[PDB]
Symmetry: D2
Subunit: 198 residues, 4 copies
């Protein structure tokens, strides 16, 4: 009942920033596996929930969280990126980024440190904190969802697992961070932003 979403562009669309080969492996291989493992795990859960088996239920948690998170995370990732993307946002979003981080440049600097800060697998996030309406920068381990574990609403996420860049950038996570700013689809981030204050 969960399906692999189609990329809103081609594998070679985010070039030269994101290599077309990484884009296919990432979408067709990695993301494909999460959706698949989520469906069996979710299905298995209904059988455990159905019998009242609390042991099977609790046992299936790491799998549900990891595959569930991977599906959530990557669905949002593709939409945050675009061949038509780049630069900086406008209107509401741009006024808020300024107001909260100092300037647009200070925001990037903070989202980059949070993304490189991750030790092991993980993600960097620009989210929205509902209690006291403000933007926030958070880092998540492995495939842990941003909203599912912190409550923040995901606006812009930066996959910082080694599979998201190693083929092209190798061990230099900072260079991957630098390049990626060019493909950020802000009208996507903006759309996500307007739906939070309402």
């Amino acid at each position: 009942k969960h399906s692999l979403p189609d990329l809103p562009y081609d594998y070679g669309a985010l070039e030269p920033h994101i290599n077309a080969q990484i884009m296919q492996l990432h979408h067709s291989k990695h993301h494909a596996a999460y959706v698949n493992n989520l469906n069996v795990t979710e299905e298995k859960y209904q059988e455990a929930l159905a019998k009242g088996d609390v042991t099977a239920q609790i046992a299936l948690q790491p799998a549900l969280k990891f595959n569930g998170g991977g599906h959530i995370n990557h669905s949002i990732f593709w939409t945050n990126l675009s061949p038509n993307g780049g630069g900086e946002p406008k209107g509401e979003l741009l006024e808020a980024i300024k107001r909260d981080f100092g300037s647009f440049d200070k925001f990037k600097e903070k989202l980059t440190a949070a993304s490189v800060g991750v030790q092991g697998s993980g993600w960097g996030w620009l989210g929205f904190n509902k209690e006291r309406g403000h933007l926030q920068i958070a880092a998540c381990p492995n495939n842990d969802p941003l909203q599912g574990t912190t409550g923040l609403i995901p606006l812009l996420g930066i996959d910082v697992w080694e599979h998201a860049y190693y083929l092209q950038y190798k061990n230099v996570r900072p260079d991957y961070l630098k390049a990626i700013w060019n493909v950020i689809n802000w009208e996507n981030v903006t759309e996500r932003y307007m739906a939070c204050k309402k």
Copy 2:
């Protein structure tokens, strides 16, 4: 659909080892709350599973694990204890405890260190490892189930949370450990033991 099990004895049955007041609070107040919170959490999960909401699903995990675990753990605890209990086991179980820990006395010494070892809330367990048929001593945090998180089959569990003893023994966890050995219902542990090798 989950209900609070009835104690196989009275609140004042495990005296003087376990105070009758602790027994009532523990059963009627603490255990009562887990069963109750588990039912709403499980019920809430079916609604999230029903809509395919992975975020609600992952969000409800800490609650399901804690209340689920608390119900599992305490159900097993009451049965491990008895007013007719005490001493040491016999037959199969006694030969295995000897074989695996050195002697019965070395086993107690190890289960005690594992129970006092817990820093914060937790449990001490004598379990059974299916892969390579042997008894094992494990410690679990908060209300994390033994089988649900480690795979071991629970035989004898020792609640080491402060609510399981503070009124009677105060901060002296070691004295509570010493006293409890007198109320262990081994025929219960034995029954649990025979069902593992078959």
Copy 3:
């Protein structure tokens, strides 16, 4: 070498809100055991350091964070309480509380909710975020120290480990929280706010 700080008042000074039996036991047993094991773990860590033992250094971490955090946590705690009033804070801090949590009463209940939501052993805090420049509430497991694990400088803490209230309020953590506002030393909390000077 680390030392146990004498209570800033008498054991039974916080009654009827916090019993003398509780304070006595909490300070001279629990806290007393934290500073000792902290000193031992610290002694053991400097020998592992002189030696190139990275294995021994990592093995000590859990004892160091628990006991080291236990002493940090409990030290501030005593200074957060006082025989002399609870009520409301004045000046700068009170304003900040309103600027961030809407009002004092709304702050009051968001911290109560955080303290009550702690599953297992832990603490509830009011801290100061120096990188955002505002106040914020947080929860910490077992004795994990606020500043060393979150960067948030602690102003007011509330121990929700069962040994902090059980002898008096039993399982009713919500009643222990109502009564502790009557003894919160807001003079201390205000000094701690103007410590990360504004």
Copy 4:
């Protein structure tokens, strides 16, 4: 001060099983960065120690366990691999493997399953349990060192972080595992077994 150990063989010595581009990058970039940050974190920890700073000591833990574990983990790793054969081990170790995992091939696959089941970054191990007196398999997250976090003395380790196989095997972790048995230095693994002398 800690130092980078030279590979016991040439960068391209493990081909076609493990490429030279991978080994080069893995040793001179990743490992090289671990020993440095380990030395810095260690320098910073002795100043926090001289001072009575328990807050700073706890803040350093994550950098110390990751980098300190990274160096421990990667050091043993190089000595687990060799241009000279994989195949089967002889004598005592081989017997023990059979006594505990049934057979060599059955051990082979239980460690593969452990290495493949790692969600995110981590390692798969074959260790020796000194308190039970037998061999056992384990999995460790990120760079958490086996002995410092489990007490199990490491004999054979398998890095399953994506930077260990991606450039060559891509997403197919199961293929990287098949090929690594061809380069396992069983002479080293046997010395490590007779190190915790039997």
